[PDB]
């Protein structure tokens with residue numbers, strides 16, 4: 075059993091909207107503000123889900139080490155690094171270019187970490203940062219396998235971002251009965267578009283879920299990331315750090331998860347027309 | 352045979368770096384400046400590859416119509432729209448959320464267009480805009496099936512963008528002998544980072560390919576896209592329009608394609624360290 079006493083969560087979302095930045099800062103805020111043992115297992119082959127916790131040194135992926143150095147080289151000292159506030163970090167990596175299923179590569183990396191006993195039993199929080207650009211059978215494997223039954227969807231007030239969120243919701247619904255997976259809520263990484271908060275409220279209401287937090291747009295993210303670090307580490311006192319603190323508190327106390335009611339093509343089109351997207 | 356007298360090309364690249372903007376403007380510039388019959392078949396489920404040609408009206412995806420309206424509803428009037436300069440537009444769409452392979456969905460959409468006789472025999476240029484965020488067996492299916500044997504890679508001076516480009520190159524190499532696929536060149540969508548042109552020259556030289564064009568960063572793209580249209584249509588006289596014109600001329604005259612020599616983990620890491628990424 076992977077981290078039986080931890081709150082295991084899966085963060086799914088499209089790329090290009092700050093999903094990795096929000097996940098890293100949420101983990102940092104749990105470790106920093108609530109003294110929690112945290113781990114992040116990256117499951118997005120096109121995103122660096124741990125660099126800001128590792129102060130800008132990108133870690134080797136489990137799959138790349140297995141493909142280039144071999145299975146024996148896949149060791150905890152090699153693929154699992156410790157970062158800000160002792161957060162543990164692991165990156166699954168991608169499949170054999172042009173041949174392997176990327177969702178299978180994710181599961182192989184998780185299985186390999188299991189065999190290595192790489193998930194501390196005293197973890198308080200484990201995050202799996204999964205690609206949500208496409209809810210293909212491969213990237214839905216974490217949902218089918220119940221890697222984590224608490225799922226959060228990162229979105230933004232942009233058409234493709236909401237389409238992806240709605241499709242992640244369909245994938246959660248697909249396996250809710252079989253794997254017990256549930257939607258804990260929607261995280262909006264604000265894009266700052268007219269009506270964005272109202273759009274998010276309606277979106278959440280139509281899917282039968284809730285907005286766990288509206289993460290504002292703040293240039294301190296770029297300043298902190300420029301120093302290859304999280305906002306929490308860069309300046310724990312600033313307003314954006316307190317936003318991530320509230321998000322982290324909300325995701326960690328949450329005990330009301332739901333089987334989502336995704337919107338149909340026509341309903342989604344009506345919604346993005348109403349808010350002029 | 353799909354468009355036997357056309358120059359069929361596949362544009363592969365990570366999301367978030369303007370791949371769709373470059374593809375649409377390259378098609379527009381071919382149609383506008385060279386009076387060419389052009390078609391774009393979108394094969395990226397998380398990107399709108401035809402919206403700017405369709406003046407901002409997002410077209411229904413072949414897969415979504417098949418899943419919601421049924422196979423009979425999949426008609427050329429329904430999934431194939433005409434846009435700026437009579438460019439034809441089709442979007443494959445994604446798989447059944449949480450169950451289908453997205454690469455298979457792409458091939459199903461192409462097969463369905465074939466059955467509908469939706470690829471005009473007098474096309475001059477056909478573009479397949481494929482997701483390159485992950486070179487999984489699914490998204491490499493166009494390479495394995497030889498949908499197009501002329502492949503171009505869009506990248507930028509950003510670490511994940513170059514990693515993805517190198518992996519697309521591995522996928523092209525994987526099927527070069529079996530499907531005849533070849534790399535026609537690298538397109539850099541400039542991010543404007545120190546040393547970016549030199550980085551691109553070295554990257555291209557190590558892979559044994561060439562830089563088809565360095566597409567500068569220009570705020571006119573955002574202005575044109577705000578009016579839901581391509582730079583070519585918004586203002587064919589501006590400098591950025593002439594950049595896309597040169598790109599379009601280069602990709603359409605190109606007759607020197609190569610079997611790429613991708614870089615190893617260590618070589619890529621050295622390169623991004625040298626250029627401080």
Ligand code: FES
Pocket residue numbers: 174175176177178210211212213451452453454487489
């Ligand atoms: S990554 Fe294999 S089904 Fe999509």
Ligand code: FES
Pocket residue numbers: 174175176177210212451452453454455487488489490
């Ligand atoms: S989308 Fe099916 S193997 Fe990746």
Ligand SMILES: [Ca+2]
Pocket residue numbers: 079080081198
């Ligand atoms: Ca506990």
Ligand SMILES: [Ca+2]
Pocket residue numbers: 356357358475
């Ligand atoms: Ca011809």
